[PDB]
Each structure stands twice: as C-alpha cells, then as structure tokens.
C-alpha cells in the first residue's frame, strides 16, 4: 500500500495526512475521489454534523499508515452521528443518505481487535 499525500482540498487537515488509492468506491486517483466528495461540500459548510467532513474523508481518502497494511474504516458511531445530523437536510434537498454509506457496514468501537475502526 503506497501512501499519497492528501490532495483533495476538503480532506486536508483532518487529523491524518496520507491516503491510499484506490478507495472503496473504486476511485483510482484523488482527483476522482475529490470530484465526488466535493459534491458534499455544501453540507460540510452548513455544519449539519461536526462529524461529516472526517467521516466522508475517512472513506474517500482513507488513512494510509507507513507500515500498517490493514484497513482502518471510520467507526459505526461516527457514521451514525453524521447520518443523524445530516440525513434530514439531505432528504429536504431531495436526496437520501447514500446507500453505500450505511453505518451497519462499519466496525463497532472496541468490539473486536481483529477489525479496528477509527473514531476519536
């Protein structure tokens, strides 16, 4: 897993600096990942959830660590906080919480040491 400095603007300065491609949406470049995640930018700016930027970036520009090769998804709780605060506004604009980002696909904080998640 070769690490790339994050170049997607809205994912700069979120807690980690390096990502790896392709991401889970099969985007093979950060230009493609950024083109999609920046569609959410209005929701980040209106602050429907303080967790939204980190949650989205943890999927679109997932964390890359120098030696550690295992995946590090966001935690189910982070997703649930973001879905709680932002899915009502999304429905008001005429959309729905994206099916790809259903929180029950995410590991639970501390429930397992075989699948680690990101929260804090």
């Amino acid at each position: 897993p070769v690490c790339q400095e994050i170049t997607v603007p809205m994912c700069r300065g979120i807690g980690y600096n390096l990502t790896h491609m392709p991401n889970q949406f099969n985007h093979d470049t950060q230009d493609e990942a950024g083109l999609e995640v920046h569609q959410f930018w209005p929701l980040v700016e209106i602050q429907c959830s303080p967790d939204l930027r980190f949650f989205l970036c943890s999927m679109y520009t997932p964390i890359c660590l120098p030696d550690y090769h295992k995946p590090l998804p966001p935690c189910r709780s982070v997703c649930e906080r973001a879905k709680a605060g932002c899915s009502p506004l999304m429905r008001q604009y005429g959309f729905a919480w994206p099916e790809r980002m259903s929180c029950d696909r995410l590991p639970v904080l501390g429930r397992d040491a075989e699948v680690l998640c990101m929260d804090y």
Partner: antibody
Amino acid sequence: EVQLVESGGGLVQPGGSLRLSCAASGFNIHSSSIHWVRQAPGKGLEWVAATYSSFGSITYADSVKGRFTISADTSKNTAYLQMNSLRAEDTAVYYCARYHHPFGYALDYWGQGTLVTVSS
Amino acid sequence: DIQMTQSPSSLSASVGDRVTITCRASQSVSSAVAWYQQKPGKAPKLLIYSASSLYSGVPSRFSGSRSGTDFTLTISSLQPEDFATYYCQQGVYLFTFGQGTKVEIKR
C-alpha cells in the same frame, strides 16, 4: 482538455423521442454531477435535470418529470438525456453542465448547446 | 418553488460606466446565489458563486454582494465586450434562474 461536448440535436415530431449526448473529457462523469439546462428561443435559462454521483441521485424539473430520463455510458464518458413525448414547448437549446468543483452552488463547465426543434 | 425576480430587464450604458443588476429572492434564502454572463450563440459563463465569490478567470470589474433577499451584480467599469445577457441563479443543488438582464453598450 476539461470540457463537455453535446450532440444529438435536431428536428423531432410532436410526441416523438430524441436522445441527447453530453461527452466529457478531462474528468470522469461517473464521479461528478451533470446537469441539464435549456433555453427556448429568445427566452431565459430553465434548469431541467441533474445527477449526483455522491448521492446516487437523479432529479427532474416538474416540467419534464415523467418524459425525460438520464442515463450514462461510463466507458464512453458520456451522459445521455432521453426525451420522450416531446411537446412544442420543449423546443430549445439544451446544455449540459458540470456541478461547480470544488466549491459547489453553481455550474462551472458547460457544453456548447444543441438545438432541439419539435415540429411537424 | 423559489422565484428570482431580476431587474432591470435591460439597460444601456457607456464604456467605463458602473452597472448594477439586482435579483430578489421571493423568500428568505441562503447566500446560494450565482451570476452568469451569456453572449450570443454561446453557453452561459460563471461569474460569481455564493453571492460574492469570484469564479476563476473572471475580470476584476465584476463583483457581487447581498443585502437581505436582494443580490446585486456590479460591473465597476463596463467594457465593449461586456455586452451580454446576465442571469442570476438560486440554489444549492437544484437550480432556478432569474429572467435575465440584457446589457447594451452606449457609444
């Protein structure tokens, strides 16, 4: 380099059908948002429809809902506007346009427009 | 259904003149208002987004501002190539347009 090119415009009988194409270069449509905007001769701009890859959504203006359908051929990096049951009031120049990157709230790249004439 | 009412519908002004175009939302809206310039036979070109942010490459004489439900596009010094119709746009993800302002150059 980064651009949009439309094709498919021309004459169609009232109640007929016509498919427009919006061919992209320099970015992948399947990770972007493509909108359609039309302009009747001598009139103003009217927003018609849009897809968002982020939301996985397709939205149609009430004036065309039920008659117009969007699809895409990702291998050709081309979006389509399928028009059915065409009316005289659908006569217009049709534009496709990209949702503004990175900041949103607007349409940054536009195709050159193609004229659809609904006449017998 | 938000309505954007644009005024004036047309205007004439000399090179070097200051030109102001106004678009009024029918109800309280956010600053999600954009301005476009459309020249004959061409697609609209984005000038301003989010009421007052200048788009890439847009000349310094264009600017935007808002007061309440009133959004204004200002050309500080009209140039002959600024002949166009100007449109306001409302919306975050789905858009509605004002009816346009035709700007003609007095010479």
